């Protein structure tokens, strides 16, 4: 088939470049991978091409430009590559963490757009610099395609002022744009649209609450198909318990500790972002699998941490049920913990039965796959409970495709491929076939989508 409508997506950190290559016309992920230790000794690419063994190569990358060059060379390599030449790529979608209130939707990057991103860099100091370095690097390597910014905060720009304002001097909002922004926007967008499909409803008629429980974790209250409130804040620090981030805390507690320790703001910021959360409570574990395993061995710090995560999730679900002003149609679990953490889901939902959230423990235990969307609520639960594995890369891919084509707009005025009842994820469909060979009962909880055939 025609193989020339390919989209590259990139997510660049201070030390890494993650990539995916998507063939739009064949609706297929051709490859994904990561360059690690960028700007450091020992830079290395791990490249996973469809249908092939993992490829690993150490090659120095003192800059993000070297990392993007290594990716392109690997993608076009005759033996390990997946595209014939670099011109197969027709657009690049870049993750940008923070758009302030200057960006409500994805954009094609221009010099003026880059200047505007510099005006908001101070809002996302731990993330935006490397995101922008990745844009600048890829523009040098792939100069003849549009480079697009898909912005983690943009989804949440529908929040009303009563949700996004902090109770702080109004001058801090007016002069420094201090307000709630929220993150995980591409995940919430994708999962909100999938939830609407599963419910058989137009998005604008849906009222749902989504928990993106990854290493970073946040919740979104979706009212009439739009973000109404979300748990992260000005920065990704606020809200739920996370792997290494504190989430919610008395704003004065960091001062008490700074006085006690001698720490200064940037290193209190790093303690709250890199030494807190599950790692802080347990003293050693970041991954929820390790917390759950240690709890099962008797580790009281892990048992506490597990329960703190559960309790804060319960409180946020209750808060956002209140904020909706009505019973939600559904709650949604996504990201790694949401998709695999059956014990977290059980403990959360069992504490919410008086709010209409009735899990079926048998269904919940089966939902331990990335390859299917499932319904784990009891048949008569007032509120449906869905596990919807996310697809942030697809949002980035489709935004870049639609910006290149000229049809992209904000989601209240634009229709995504994955809003179709007949949308399929080819790689996940193949993985599901394998999952069903080992656990045939999983088929009983896969969602039944109205209008699909």
Ligand X SMILES: Nc1ncnc2c1ncn2[C@@H]1O[C@H](COP(=O)(O)O)[C@@H](O)[C@H]1O
Instruction: List the catalytic residues.
Output: 152
Nearest approach, Cβ of 149 to its own copies (angstroms)?
Answer: 22
**How many residues lie near its own copies (CB under 8 A)?**
79
Hey, what are 62's tokens?
């003192």
Question: What's the closest the beta carbon of residue 325 comes to ligand X, in angstroms?
Answer: 24
Site string for its own copies, 320-339 (x = CB under 8 A): xxxx-xxx------------
Q: Flag whether 289 is marked binding.
A: yes
Residue 214 in marked binding region: yes
Contact status, residue 151 vs residue 185, Cβ threshold 8 Å: yes
Q: Which residue from 25, 58, 119, 122 is in contact with its own copies, where contact means CB under 8 A? A: 122
HSE (side-chain half, CA atoms, 13 Å) at 389: 22
Q: Decide: helix, strand or coil at residue 219.
A: strand
From the list 326, 331, 376, the residue with the least C-alpha distance to 352 is 331
Which of 103, 190, 320, 340 is close enough to bind ligand X by CB under 6 A? 340
Binding track, positions 75-114, relative to its own copies; x by CB under 8 A: ----------------------------------------
Q: Any contact of residue 287 with ligand X (CB under 6 A)?
A: yes
Among 340, 401, 352, 414, CA closest to 377: 352
Pairing of strands 89-96, 6-13: parallel
Closest distance between ligand X and the C-beta of residue 119, in Å?
A: 29
Buried b (16+ CB within 10 A) or exposed e, 150-178: bbbbbbbbbbeeebbeeeeeeeebeeebb
Residue 93 vs 341, nearer CB to ligand X: 341
The minimum distance between CB 179 and ligand X, in angstroms, equals: 25
- Residues 6 or more apart whose CB falls under 8 angstroms from that of 441 comprise 366
Among the listed residues 34, 142, 145, 305, the single contact to its own copies using CB under 8 A = 305
255 binds its own copies per the rule CB under 8 A: yes
Are 203 and 225 spatial neighbours (Cβ–Cβ below 8 Å)? Answer: yes
Indicate which single residue of 56, 253, 429, 443 sits in contact with its own copies (rule: CB under 8 A): 253
Q: Which residues bind ligand X (CB under 6 A)?
A: 214-215, 243, 287-289, 335-337, 340-341
């Amino acid at each position: 088939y025609f193989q020339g409508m390919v989209i590259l997506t990139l997510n660049c950190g201070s030390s890494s470049v993650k990539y995916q290559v998507y063939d739009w016309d064949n609706h297929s992920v051709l490859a994904s991978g990561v360059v690690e230790r960028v700007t450091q000794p020992g830079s290395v690419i791990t490249h996973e091409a469809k249908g092939k063994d993992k490829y690993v190569l150490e090659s120095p990358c003192p800059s993000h430009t070297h990392a993007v060059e290594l990716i392109i060379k690997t993608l076009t390599d005759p033996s390990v590559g997946v595209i014939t030449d670099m011109n197969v790529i027709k657009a690049v979608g870049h993750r940008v963490t923070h758009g302030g209130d200057k960006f409500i939707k994805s954009v094609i990057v221009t010099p003026e757009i880059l200047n505007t991103f510099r005006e908001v860099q101070d809002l996302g100091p731990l993330h935006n610099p490397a995101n922008i370095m990745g844009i600048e690097a890829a523009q040098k390597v792939l100069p003849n395609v549009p480079h697009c910014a898909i912005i983690d905060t943009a989804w949440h720009q529908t929040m009303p002022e009563t949700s996004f304002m902090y109770a702080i001097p109004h001058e801090w909002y007016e002069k420094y744009s201090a307000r709630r922004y929220g993150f995980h926007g591409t995940s919430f967008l994708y999962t909100a649209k999938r939830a609407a499909v599963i419910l058989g409803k137009k998005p604008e008629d849906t009222n749902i609450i989504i928990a993106h429980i990854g290493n970073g974790a946040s919740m979104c209250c979706v009212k009439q198909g739009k973000c109404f409130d979300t748990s992260m804040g000005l920065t990704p620090l606020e809200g739920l318990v996370m792997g290494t981030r504190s989430g919610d805390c008395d704003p004065a507690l960091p001062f008490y500790i700074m006085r006690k320790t001698g720490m200064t703001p940037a290193e209190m910021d790093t303690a709250l972002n890199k030494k807190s959360g599950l790692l802080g409570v347990t003293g050693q574990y970041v991954d929820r699998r390790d917390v759950s395993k240690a709890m099962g061995e008797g580790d009281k710090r892990a048992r506490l941490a597990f329960n703190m995560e559960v309790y804060r999730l319960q409180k946020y679900f209750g808060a956002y049920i209140a904020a909706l002003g009505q019973k939600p149609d559904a709650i949604v679990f996504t990201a790694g913990v949401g998709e695999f953490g059956f014990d977290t889901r059980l403990a959360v939902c069992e504490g919410l039965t008086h709010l209409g959230i009735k899990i079926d423990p048998k269904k919940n235990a089966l939902a331990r796959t990335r390859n299917a969307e499932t319904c784990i609520s009891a048949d008569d639960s007032p509120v449906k409970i869905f596990v919807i594995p996310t697809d942030e890369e697809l949002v980035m891919t489709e935004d870049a495709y639609a910006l290149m084509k000229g049809t992209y707009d904000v989601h209240t005025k634009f229709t995504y491929s994955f809003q179709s009842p007949n949308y399929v994820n080819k790689a996940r469909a193949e993985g599901l076939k394998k999952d069903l060979e080992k656990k045939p009962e999983l088929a009983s909880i896969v969602v039944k989508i109205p209008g699909a055939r």
